[PDB]
Scaffold this active site. Structure first.
Site, mmCIF file in Angstrom:
data_model
loop_
_atom_site.group_PDB
_atom_site.id
_atom_site.type_symbol
_atom_site.label_atom_id
_atom_site.label_comp_id
_atom_site.label_asym_id
_atom_site.label_seq_id
_atom_site.Cartn_x
_atom_site.Cartn_y
_atom_site.Cartn_z
ATOM 1 N N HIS A 145 0.716 -1.580 0.518
ATOM 2 C CA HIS A 145 0.393 -0.037 0.335
ATOM 3 C C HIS A 145 0.790 1.302 -0.147
ATOM 4 O O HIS A 145 0.048 2.408 -0.653
ATOM 5 C CB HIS A 145 -0.957 0.199 1.213
ATOM 6 N N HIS A 165 5.829 7.034 6.820
ATOM 7 C CA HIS A 165 5.659 6.810 5.316
ATOM 8 C C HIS A 165 4.754 7.966 4.604
ATOM 9 O O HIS A 165 4.437 8.837 4.963
ATOM 10 C CB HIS A 165 4.431 5.655 5.321
ATOM 11 N N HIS A 194 2.312 9.110 1.259
ATOM 12 C CA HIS A 194 0.867 8.735 0.394
ATOM 13 C C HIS A 194 1.118 9.395 -1.364
ATOM 14 O O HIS A 194 1.338 11.207 -0.788
ATOM 15 C CB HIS A 194 -0.348 9.437 0.494
ATOM 16 N N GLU A 213 -3.816 13.413 0.830
ATOM 17 C CA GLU A 213 -4.958 13.513 1.906
ATOM 18 C C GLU A 213 -5.427 14.199 1.977
ATOM 19 O O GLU A 213 -6.812 14.344 1.657
ATOM 20 C CB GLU A 213 -4.429 11.699 2.874
ATOM 21 N N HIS A 223 3.151 11.243 6.449
ATOM 22 C CA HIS A 223 2.346 10.363 7.854
ATOM 23 C C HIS A 223 3.829 10.172 8.502
ATOM 24 O O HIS A 223 4.576 8.948 8.074
ATOM 25 C CB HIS A 223 1.648 9.825 7.885
ATOM 26 N N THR A 257 -6.379 6.399 7.967
ATOM 27 C CA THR A 257 -7.061 7.076 6.477
ATOM 28 C C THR A 257 -6.836 5.688 6.390
ATOM 29 O O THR A 257 -6.920 5.793 4.678
ATOM 30 C CB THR A 257 -5.948 7.651 5.917
ATOM 31 N N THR A 258 -6.163 4.277 6.547
ATOM 32 C CA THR A 258 -6.217 2.956 5.035
ATOM 33 C C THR A 258 -7.405 2.077 6.279
ATOM 34 O O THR A 258 -6.956 2.475 7.805
ATOM 35 C CB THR A 258 -4.786 2.828 5.825
HETATM 36 C C1 LIG Z 1 -2.202 -0.612 7.619
HETATM 37 N N1 LIG Z 1 -2.002 -0.790 8.889
HETATM 38 C C2 LIG Z 1 -1.753 -1.643 9.853
HETATM 39 C C3 LIG Z 1 -3.163 -2.032 10.534
HETATM 40 C C4 LIG Z 1 -3.532 -3.398 11.098
HETATM 41 C C5 LIG Z 1 -4.627 -3.771 11.135
HETATM 42 C C6 LIG Z 1 -4.757 -2.091 12.736
HETATM 43 C C7 LIG Z 1 -3.942 -1.455 12.833
HETATM 44 C C8 LIG Z 1 -2.799 -1.155 11.761
HETATM 45 C C9 LIG Z 1 -1.681 0.920 9.483
HETATM 46 O O1 LIG Z 1 -1.061 -0.015 10.303
HETATM 47 N N2 LIG Z 1 -1.732 1.497 8.997
HETATM 48 C C10 LIG Z 1 -1.093 2.984 9.415
HETATM 49 C C11 LIG Z 1 -1.170 3.108 10.592
HETATM 50 C C12 LIG Z 1 -1.001 4.398 11.342
HETATM 51 C C13 LIG Z 1 -0.682 5.663 10.486
HETATM 52 C C14 LIG Z 1 -1.913 5.638 9.344
HETATM 53 S S1 LIG Z 1 -1.986 7.051 8.685
HETATM 54 N N3 LIG Z 1 -2.394 6.869 7.159
HETATM 55 O O2 LIG Z 1 -3.418 7.064 8.774
HETATM 56 O O3 LIG Z 1 -0.782 7.810 8.920
HETATM 57 C C15 LIG Z 1 -1.697 3.911 8.891
HETATM 58 ZN ZN LIG Z 2 -0.571 7.453 5.653
#
Ligand SMILES: CN(Cc1ccccc1)C(=O)Nc1cccc(S(N)(=O)=O)c1
Ligand SMILES: [Zn+2]
Length: 256
Positions: A60, A90, A92, A102, A115, A194-195
């Site tokens: 992703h 990471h 986007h 985003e 992020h 956001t994921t």
């Molecule tokens: C998809 N997964 C794996 C995941 C799977 C299950 C439960 C919890 C997590 C993530 O950890 N994502 C993520 C984590 C931190 C920040 C952001 S973000 N883009 O909001 O900064 C995205």
């Molecule tokens: Zn992110």
């Protein structure tokens, strides 16, 4: 779930009904409606002792991961109570310079968004933190295309070694201070990952000042693949969720 026509953001609610929840991210930051909050403290970004370990293509995005078993790189202050430990960063990004972020600012989309993910140490680890309304603090930084960002180049140059999903590479001694803009002026609001699983556990802190990266730097992001090795090539581009309804939330500004 992913970012394609048949599994993208408009489909996520079927597996993750919280996608239609009350504090989803990202959002549009309407700069005229955000309110200056003089009680907000300056952000404290303490990254001098950061220990990066590895970079991973997870299908992703790519994550630069840190040792979060001690308070080595922490975020404090601002809207936050207590201490939040850096676990990974990471990005986007888009297929074109005109999209990729985003969050948006007065509906403007940036080419990419960084992020820096931190978890509240009162919850002991990341997996417990994501189950709490104040579990995470994500520092978001917009990227625009112009001059190169020198502190990003070490990231760009390793991407060839993690082209496909599931590949990782050693990535030690990387200093995330080289990814910050000059000003730490910010907007903040309560939101979500956001994921998927879109958990409503994030205090968002979005910096007003973008960083500039070069066209060549972002073009290298766009050579990554969503697929695994030996699968048909799908370029890792447009891995961003669009803005979600603000609902019953107020965005606060640290600056006038
Ligand atoms: C998809 N997964 C794996 C995941 C799977 C299950 C439960 C919890 C997590 C993530 O950890 N994502 C993520 C984590 C931190 C920040 C952001 S973000 N883009 O909001 O900064 C995205
Ligand atoms: Zn992110």
């Amino acid at each position: 779930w992913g970012y394609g026509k048949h599994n993208g953001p408009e489909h996520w609610h079927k597996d993750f009904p919280i996608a239609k929840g009350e504090r989803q991210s990202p959002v549009d930051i309407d700069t005229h409606t955000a309110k200056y909050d003089p009680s907000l403290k300056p952000l404290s970004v303490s990254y001098d002792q950061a220990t990066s370990l590895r970079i991973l293509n997870n299908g992703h995005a790519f994550n630069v991961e840190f040792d979060d078993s001690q308070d080595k790189a922490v975020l404090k202050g601002g809207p936050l109570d207590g201490t939040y430990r850096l676990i990974q960063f990471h990005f986007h990004w888009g297929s074109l310079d005109g999209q990729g972020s985003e969050h948006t600012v007065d509906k403007k989309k940036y080419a990419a968004e960084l992020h820096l993910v931190h978890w509240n140490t009162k919850y002991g680890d990341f997996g417990k933190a994501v189950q709490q309304p104040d579990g995470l603090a994500v520092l978001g930084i917009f990227l625009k295309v112009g001059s190169a960002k020198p502190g990003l180049q070490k990231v760009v140059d390793v991407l060839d070694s993690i082209k496909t999903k599931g590949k990782s590479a050693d990535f030690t001694n990387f200093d995330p201070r080289g990814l910050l803009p000059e000003s730490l002026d910010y907007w903040t609001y309560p939101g979500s990952l956001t994921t998927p699983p879109l958990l409503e556990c994030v205090t968002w802190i979005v910096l007003k000042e973008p960083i500039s990266v070069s066209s060549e730097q972002v073009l290298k992001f766009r050579k990554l693949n969503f697929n695994g090795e030996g699968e048909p090539e799908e370029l890792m581009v447009d891995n961003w969720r669009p803005a979600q309804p603000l609902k019953n939330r107020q965005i606060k500004a640290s600056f006038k």
